[PDB]
Design a protein around this ligand. Structure first.
Ligand SMILES: [Mg+2]
Ligand SMILES: [Mg+2]
Ligand SMILES: [Mg+2]
Ligand SMILES: [Mg+2]
Ligand SMILES: [Mg+2]
Ligand SMILES: [Mg+2]
Ligand SMILES: [Mg+2]
Ligand SMILES: [Mg+2]
Ligand SMILES: [Mg+2]
Ligand SMILES: [Mg+2]
Ligand SMILES: [Mg+2]
Ligand SMILES: [Mg+2]
Ligand SMILES: [Mg+2]
Ligand SMILES: [Mg+2]
Ligand SMILES: [Mg+2]
Ligand SMILES: [Mg+2]
Ligand SMILES: [Mg+2]
Ligand SMILES: [Mg+2]
Ligand SMILES: [Mg+2]
Ligand SMILES: [Mg+2]
Ligand SMILES: [Mg+2]
Ligand SMILES: [Mg+2]
Ligand SMILES: [Mg+2]
Ligand SMILES: [Mg+2]
Ligand SMILES: [Mg+2]
Ligand SMILES: [Mg+2]
Ligand SMILES: [Mg+2]
Lengths: 51, 180, 134, 126, 51, 148, 125, 103, 51
RNA sequence: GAGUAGGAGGGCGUGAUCGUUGCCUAGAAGUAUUGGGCGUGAGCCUAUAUGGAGCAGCGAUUAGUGCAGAUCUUGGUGGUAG
RNA sequence: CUGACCCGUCUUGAAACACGGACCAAGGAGUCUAUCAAUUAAGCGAGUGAUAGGGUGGAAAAACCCGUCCGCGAAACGAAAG
RNA sequence: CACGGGAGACCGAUAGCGAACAAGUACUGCGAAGGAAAGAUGAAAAGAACUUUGAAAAGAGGGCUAAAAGACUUGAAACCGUUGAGAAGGAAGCUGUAGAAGAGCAAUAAACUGGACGGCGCAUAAGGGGGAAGUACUAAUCACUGCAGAGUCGAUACGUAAA
């Protein structure tokens, strides 16, 4: 028999972000990429890496 | 068995909202003012804490014109601190010399306050300057919003000046004689 | 920093293992296995790593601040010392690097336990090479 | 991978494989050439034939060498002389083998073969 | 990172003096606290004199 | 989304917080579908939160064309905010000739006075002016010019 | 063999809290559930009935999560976890996962004896 | 129908199930347009992409202040240019015969 | 916010800093806000889905 | 320190997705347990047996996410009863 | 030894001489789209934000840049002339 | 919709199209029309040689195979048989409290830390010089802030009829 809520195609999956927040995000990301504690905290292996 | 209201478990509504924001920095600024509040007997800091824990919406705008309008002879030398975002009023022509401390300066408010010979301050700085809040001026912005007009009294009770929720404003919309 | 990094990694650290709501850390420099500002070596300043080598030698790793220098002393994570005196040497080193009482206690713990550990390990490696030969 | 028209779906491929028509199957079941032959024709792999000489590389039967009795493409089997097992009643039966576990010691030579080999070598070295 | 990479980084984004080129008016986030060490701030003269 | 929703915390409570007596039922309970019975059992609603909903107002427009009714308004206070700072300062010091501000190019048509103006003189080019707009403009040492 | 200090461990209730009428049915397992029934005996605290799961029952904070062997229980998933027990050796005991193979088991047992760590699931022959 | 909220405006009153529009083609479509444009360039190579467009004022009182791209040149204009419609067309110029110059 | 000069390393050699030292871009200055990374990341992941 | 209708705050357990840490022919999942334990409780960990290829934790993302009932659906079985 | 009526349900009132349930497995019920509002976290602020579309781009429907208009706010009161 | 291509935070044999299969099939209906159930031995049939008792099915021996996995992967519950340990004078089950019997590779237990000394094997100690790296200071240098000459890029309701 048919479902409870037969699931549709037009369920809206995609979302749209304000540009400024996309950017702020990318930024803060880059900012993060620069500190040893963080990239090490991510599990990357930076031991023999220098600067 | 005892007849106490709410069983002595009465919740205290007199308290400071525990803030859920995620900027790590708000939480930190807040660590700071928790310190200043318990270890400093200065009302000013406690005040700053209450208002910095504000609902996102409960933080209200400071405009350059707002500051300008509230200025006394002594208000001028004094550090101006708003608990909120400070914004430019485009209709303010000349901008005084100011040392202002807020959470956020609209880049316009910043440009004009700086290019007028002013200084922009952040609360970690304020801490360092005057923890007691000595010679500081704390600006509480005026509270306005559209929501407020739908609140109050209901829309069409006797003497209700409150606004109805309507999808369009037209001659045809809740502007016609009701059923009286 | 140790503050900002706390808030940042307190929950998502890759060195993190949980047991019944008790959060422990895999950090090599952890002064206590448990996940806390203090437990977390890659965060704040005081952290130590210790490895056995060449029969007494303890490799001491002194958590060292992030450095842009002319020469590269060791891993960006930390500083690396070979100590031949080991236990005593490292005990001193600790005493220097950990000023507060607790941190001292903990590091030292890491030591005693570490050492006796490395001793057993030695015994076993011995028996192992004598097993490969005979 | 570089090309949108290349199916990466398990389904599609498995399908291609098992739905393989005979001629394509022969390709699909193929063996690796001996160091010597590799060197001779400049060709790594070759599709197996019923007259070839092969060496079983992997299995309880690894190490044994012999002629290919039957290429039974439907059963997916290659049969090799003396690779049979004996049954208690005194009855012999062949043991089937997967080509990609074989190695080609000596090819059955003839014009078509040589042409194929030639094309492969051609794109290879050039 | 590359050289071209690393250098274009700034032109693309910009800095608290200037806007970005590629983002055409993007201003990076204005920090909430100049100094993120509450250590420094709780532990300085001004603080403790009053405390 | 889903794991935030009430359902999850309602599972096994049997009424789904719709009540044991009054449970969750079809349109009959809604009071009829949509704006149903607004004038009757829903009187109180309509009257109270949408008073003046039922009825008629004054004059039908058969085809209403908005484009020609289009008239953005400006107030005196924002005038100098339209043109750059360069301008108003440079003609505060220089009294030889006076500034012309075209409200038109800014996308506005009528000028209403709202705030007050600097004592420095201006010319303002606009489609319409309010008695007070002109008042304050002229009194400032300024002039009103009619555009199309 | 590294016990620490105990307050005497006191267990408020031993018998598990059995779901009501679950002895009556197969379809009903005994995993507790809170009766919402309108007539329900239990939900009503009828003299003689089960006392349903309550907070007054939670064991005291000091003994909570304490094994009978005296240690708090720590679960070994990968090898790494072992090492953590080092700074924690006297507080916790090791428990090696069921998914970990025989070889790696002996390995971790060795490593444990070395790090001086107590193992509840340790292989005794 | 319960609270103070604004009177709803029915949407799904008819059978909309037959009448829904889906936008996934959009992704590929944009792309297609690109290639089309590009393949135009290549096939037109020596010549320009968009044909010559005159300009006019917009048709509404509010739009007058702005500038807009016309569909074609006024015969009057081609005259003052000294081109025949036909020729201008062989050139890549866009002509519009119903437009008239009042200024 | 530190903006130390960063050395541009040489590939041909295990550890060699080229003669080029470059002052750090503001992107790496940018505050590390995780909120913004969170939201944005979420939505952008969602953008890949087929219905 | 009561509580139905109802509401709020925390937590348990299940797919799949982006991460992160790992386990498995030296035996994964699943299954049985009068083996040993952990939670007040959702539930958990282990042991033994069976099994013979895949699994698991942690942070998030998402949900066709938890059943004793509806003369509930489909399937399988009783007592009546030799 | 002391205590212990059958659960679910509707009901002022259920162990009821009220109804459903002989047993077991698996399935099984507030979703999806739109709309306004209140609250919470985000960004920017007299502004804000695009959509369509252009332009680039990973194998890839992502992403990244552009996007003269438009929305909503920025002025209200009038049936309307205003 | 048809034949093609590729794909998916779909479904995964009571799900997913009704149909993973001789599925719009078997079957029903005068007819229009209705319409299911049903997928997994093994790597390879090596699908159980042979002995024995049977009229025959089949049993007992014996064998294949990593294993019978043998009409077939795993093999839960309800229900049923066997074996074990219990119990019962017109029903059963259950909270609280003790006891008895039965079943057991046992989960708890007088151990642990140190001083001095001894017997063993390994390492090299503290203290003193020394002082790489580290931190702190501090001139000379130098990121950053500030000031800021020349070149190149940009903007500009400053300015011009444009320049
Ligand atoms: Mg009481
Ligand atoms: Mg009106
Ligand atoms: Mg190849
Ligand atoms: Mg909720
Ligand atoms: Mg409830
Ligand atoms: Mg218990
Ligand atoms: Mg098309
Ligand atoms: Mg699913
Ligand atoms: Mg085995
Ligand atoms: Mg868990
Ligand atoms: Mg086995
Ligand atoms: Mg989760
Ligand atoms: Mg179920
Ligand atoms: Mg059931
Ligand atoms: Mg029957
Ligand atoms: Mg009794
Ligand atoms: Mg019953
Ligand atoms: Mg009666
Ligand atoms: Mg009834
Ligand atoms: Mg778009
Ligand atoms: Mg408007
Ligand atoms: Mg037999
Ligand atoms: Mg078996
Ligand atoms: Mg039985
Ligand atoms: Mg008996
Ligand atoms: Mg009995
Ligand atoms: Mg008896």
């Amino acid at each position: 028999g048919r479902m409870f809520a037969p699931l549709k195609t037009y369920r809206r999956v995609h979302r749209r972000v304000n540009v400024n927040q996309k950017r702020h995000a990318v930024a803060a990301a880059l900012a993060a990429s620069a500190l040893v504690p963080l990239v090490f905290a991510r599990g990357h292996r930076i031991s023999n890496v220098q600067e | 068995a005892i007849d106490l209201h709410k069983q002595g478990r009465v919740v205290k509504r007199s308290v400071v909202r525990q803030t859920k924001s995620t900027n790590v920095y708000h939480k930190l600024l807040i660590k700071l003012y928790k310190f200043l509040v318990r270890r400093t007997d200065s009302k000013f800091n406690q005040n700053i804490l209450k208002r910095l824990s504000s609902s996102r919406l409960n933080k209200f705008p400071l405009s350059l014109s707002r500051i300008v309008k509230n200025l006394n002879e002594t208000n001028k030398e004094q550090v101006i601190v708003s608990t909120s975002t400070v914004t430019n009023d485009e209709r303010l022509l000349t901008v005084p010399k100011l040392t202002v401390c807020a959470l956020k300066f609209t880049e316009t408010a910043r440009k004009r306050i700086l290019a007028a010979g002013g200084k922009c301050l952040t609360f970690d700085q304020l801490a360092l300057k005057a923890p007691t809040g000595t010679n500081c001026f704390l600006l509480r912005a005026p509270k306005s919003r559209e929501a407020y007009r739908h609140w109050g009294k209901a829309p069409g009770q006797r003497g209700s000046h409150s606004a109805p929720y309507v999808r369009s404003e037209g001659r045809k919309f809740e502007r016609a004689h009701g059923l009286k | 920093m140790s503050q900002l990094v706390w808030e940042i990694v307190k929950n998502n650290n890759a060195f993190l293992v949980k047991n019944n709501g008790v959060a422990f850390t895999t950090d090599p420099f952890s002064v206590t296995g448990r996940n806390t500002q203090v437990g977390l070596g890659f965060t704040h300043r005081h952290g130590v790593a210790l490895k056995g080598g060449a029969k007494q030698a303890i490799a001491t790793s002194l958590r060292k601040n992030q450095s842009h220098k002319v020469k590269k002393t060791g891993t960006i994570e930390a500083e690396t010392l070979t100590v031949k005196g080991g236990v005593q040497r490292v005990a001193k080193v600790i005493r220097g690097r950990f000023q507060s009482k607790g941190l001292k206690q903990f590091a030292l713990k890491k030591l005693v336990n570490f050492h006796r550990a490395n001793v057993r390990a030695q015994a076993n490696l011995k028996a192992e090479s004598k097993a490969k030969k005979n | 991978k570089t090309h949108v028209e290349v199916s990466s779906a398990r389904r599609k491929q498995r399908k291609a494989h098992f739905a393989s028509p005979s001629h394509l199957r022969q390709t699909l079941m193929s063996a690796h050439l001996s160091k010597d032959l590799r060197s001779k024709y400049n060709v790594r792999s070759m599709p197996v034939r019923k007259d070839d000489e092969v060496l079983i590389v992997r299995g309880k039967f690894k190490g044994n060498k012999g002629k290919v009795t039957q290429v039974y493409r439907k059963k997916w089997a290659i049969h090799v002389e003396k690779i049979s097992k004996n049954k208690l009643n005194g009855a012999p039966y062949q043991i089937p083998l997967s080509a990609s576990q074989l190695v080609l010691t000596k090819l059955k030579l003839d014009k078509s073969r040589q042409s194929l080999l030639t094309r492969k070598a051609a794109s290879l070295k050039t | 990172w590359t050289e071209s990479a690393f250098k274009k980084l700034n032109e693309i984004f910009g800095t608290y003096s200037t806007t970005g080129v590629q983002k055409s008016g993007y201003q990076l986030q204005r920090p909430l606290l100049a100094n993120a060490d509450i250590a420094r701030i709780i532990n300085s003269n001004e603080v403790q004199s009053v405390v | 989304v889903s794991h935030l929703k009430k359902t999850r915390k309602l599972r096994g409570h049997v009424s789904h917080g719709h009540g044991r007596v009054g449970k969750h039922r079809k349109g009959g309970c809604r009071g009829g579908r949509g704006k149903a019975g607004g004038m009757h059992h829903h009187r109180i609603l309509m009257e109270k939160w949408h008073p003046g909903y039922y009825g008629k107002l004054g004059m039908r427009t058969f085809h209403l064309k908005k484009n020609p009714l289009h008239c953005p308004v400006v107030n005196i206070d924002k005038l100098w905010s339209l043109v750059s700072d360069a301008t108003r300062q440079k003609y505060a010091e220089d009294k030889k000739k006076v500034p012309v501000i075209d409200v038109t190019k800014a996308g506005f048509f009528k000028v209403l006075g709202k705030g007050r103006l600097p004592n420095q003189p201006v010319v303002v080019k606009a489609k319409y002016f309010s008695k007070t707009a002109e008042r304050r403009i002229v009194a400032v040492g300024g002039a009103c010019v009619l555009t199309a | 063999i590294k016990p620490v200090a105990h307050k005497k461990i006191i267990k408020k209730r031993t018998k598990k809290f059995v779901r009501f009428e679950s002895e009556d049915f197969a379809k009903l397992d005994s995993s507790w559930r809170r009766p919402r029934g309108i007539d329900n005996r239990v939900r009503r605290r009828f003299r003689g009935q089960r006392r349903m799961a309550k907070i007054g029952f939670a064991s005291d904070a000091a003994t909570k999560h304490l094994l009978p062997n005296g240690f708090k229980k720590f679960l070994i998933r990968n090898p790494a976890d072992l090492e953590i027990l080092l700074m924690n050796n006297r507080t916790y005991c090791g428990e090696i996962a069921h998914n970990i193979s025989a070889q790696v088991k002996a390995a971790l047992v060795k490593r444990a004896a070395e790090l001086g760590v107590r193992l509840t699931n340790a292989n005794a022959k | 129908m319960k609270h103070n909220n604004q009177l709803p405006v029915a949407q799904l009153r008819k059978h909309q199930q037959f009448r829904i529009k889906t936008f996934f083609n959009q992704a590929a479509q944009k792309k297609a347009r690109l290639h089309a444009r590009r393949a135009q360039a290549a096939a037109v190579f020596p010549r320009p992409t968009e044909k010559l467009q005159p300009v006019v004022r917009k048709q509404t009182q509010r739009y007058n202040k702005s500038t807009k791209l016309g569909r074609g040149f006024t015969l009057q204009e081609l005259k003052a240019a000294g081109i025949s419609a036909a020729f201008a067309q062989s050139i890549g110029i866009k002509v519009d015969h119903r437009r008239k110059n009042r200024c | 916010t530190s903006r130390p000069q960063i050395h541009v390393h040489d590939a041909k050699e295990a550890n060699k800093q080229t003669a080029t030292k470059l002052t750090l871009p503001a992107v790496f200055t940018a505050p590390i806000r995780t909120d913004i990374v969170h939201k944005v990341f979420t939505d952008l992941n969602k953008n890949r889905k087929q219905a």
